[PDB]
C-alpha cells in the first residue's frame, strides 16, 4: 500500500502569493497523481489529474509538477477562494490512496489575544462540581500556548481545549480552555490563573482571579 505524504499539515500564505503544496509517495507512481480541493465545510472538486493536467474550469493559477515519487501543486497568485485543504491521491496501485491534506490559511497582521477568566458559577456549584474557564479570543498567529497555574504551580490533567478554524471575517483564532474541577478541589486554592503565551508578546499574558475576593 502506497503511503502518500503531504509533509505540511498547515501552510500559511497571504493573498497574491505563489504557494506550493507538496506530496510524496512511498513508491514510484509513474505520474498517476491527482489533486483534490475540499472547501471549508464543503465539497471536494478535482483540480488536476495525471500530475499536471487541469480539470475543466479550474483557473490557470493552478499547476501540477512531478515525476516518480515527488509531486507539487502550485498556486500562482493566491486568491481568496483558494483557502481550502488540498489532497493528493495516487492512481497506479490499488487501493487508491490519499495524502493527509494541507490547508491554506491566510496571513494577516500580528493580532494579540483577548483573554478573560471566569469563576465557577453558583448554579454549577449547587449541581456538585466547578469548572473555571478562560477564553483567549481573536489572536493571530495560530501559535498560542496556555497553562493553568493554581497557587504558583501549574496544573494540567483536568484542562480541555477548543480552537476554532481561522475566522472567515477577520482571519483570527479564538479558543476556550476549561479546567473542570469538583466543588471540594475548587474549595482549596484561592488563586486560579489562566496563562497565555504568544508571538505578539515577550510577557506571558496573565489573567487571574481570587476565590476569596469573591
Amino acid at each position: 500500500d502506497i503511503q502518500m505524504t503531504q509533509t505540511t499539515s498547515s501552510l500559511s500564505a497571504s493573498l497574491g502569493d505563489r504557494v506550493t503544496i507538496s506530496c510524496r509517495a512511498s513508491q514510484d507512481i509513474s505520474n498517476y497523481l491527482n489533486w483534490y480541493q475540499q472547501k471549508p465545510d464543503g465539497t471536494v472538486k478535482l483540480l488536476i489529474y495525471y500530475t499536471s493536467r487541469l480539470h475543466s474550469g479550474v483557473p490557470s493559477r493552478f499547476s501540477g509538477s512531478g515525476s516518480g515519487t515527488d509531486y507539487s501543486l502550485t498556486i500562482s497568485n493566491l486568491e481568496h477562494e483558494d483557502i481550502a485543504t488540498y489532497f493528493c491521491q495516487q492512481g497506479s496501485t490499488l487501493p487508491r490512496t490519499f495524502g493527509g491534506g494541507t490547508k491554506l490559511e491566510i496571513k494577516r497582521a500580528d493580532a494579540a489575544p483577548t483573554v478573560s477568566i471566569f469563576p465557577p458559577s453558583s448554579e454549577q456549584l449547587t449541581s456538585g462540581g466547578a469548572s473555571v474557564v478562560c477564553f483567549l479570543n481573536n489572536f493571530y498567529p495560530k501559535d498560542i500556548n496556555v497553562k493553568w497555574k493554581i497557587d504558583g504551580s501549574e496544573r494540567q490533567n483536568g484542562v480541555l481545549n477548543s480552537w476554532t478554524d481561522q475566522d472567515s471575517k477577520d482571519s483570527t483564532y479564538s479558543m476556550s480552555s476549561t479546567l473542570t474541577l469538583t466543588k471540594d478541589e475548587y474549595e482549596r486554592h484561592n488563586s486560579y490563573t489562566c496563562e497565555a503565551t504568544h508571538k505578539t508578546s515577550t510577557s506571558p499574558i496573565v489573567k487571574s482571579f481570587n476565590r476569596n475576593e469573591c
Binding site: 495525471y50 491534506g101 483577548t114 479558543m175
Partner: protein, 221 residues
Amino acid sequence: QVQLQQSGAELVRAGSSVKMSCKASGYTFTSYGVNWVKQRPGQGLEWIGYINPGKGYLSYNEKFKGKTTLTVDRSSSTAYMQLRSLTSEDAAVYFCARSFYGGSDLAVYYFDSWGQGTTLTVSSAKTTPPSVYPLAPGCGDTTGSSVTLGCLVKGYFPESVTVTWNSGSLSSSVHTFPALLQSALYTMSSSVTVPSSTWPSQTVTCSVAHPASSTTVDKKL
C-alpha cells in the same frame, strides 16, 4: 451535467447497520464507475471501494471488505453502501465520487465528480438536555473598556444546540466554539463582547436551544 445527491445524515446505535444512497444525474449511470470514500475529522480521505454499473463488478479496500457492501439500482440511478457492525470508529463523513470513463485496474479512474457527503454518527447515548451555566466576570478583574461574557452549555446529547445572545442582536463580537464530546456528553461554550458601561446596565441574556430534548433556556448575566 453530472450531479450526485447523497442521503441525509444518520445518527445510529453501535452494532447496528446503515444503507446510504447516491442518486446520480446528468450522465448515463452505467457508463461510469462509483467509489465510496470516507473522511474521519482530522485524518485524510480514504477509499472504501468501487463499483461499475454497466456490467463488470467491483473492487474494495481490503480493510473495509466485510463491514462494507456496495450495491446498485440501475433503474433509479442510485448507488448504495451498507455498513455493518457500526463502531464509533465508523463515525465520519462519507462521499461517493465518480471515476471518469474507460476503466480502472491502473488509472482512467480519478474522481471527477463528488457528492456532498453523508454523516454517520455512531453513538449509544440517549437524549440528554443541556445544563446552561453563565460565565460572569471575576472578582478583582480591574474594570475594562469592554466586557467579555459567556455561557457554558454542558452535558448535552445530540450535538445541535443553539446559543443566542440578546435573542438575535449581538451577531458580531460573538464566538461559538466547537463542541467537544467528553463522556457521551457534548460540551460547548460561547462568548460575547460588549463595551464597558453597556453592561451591567442594558442586560445581557444568552438563550440556549436544544430541540431534541425540547429545551429553551435563558440565562441572564
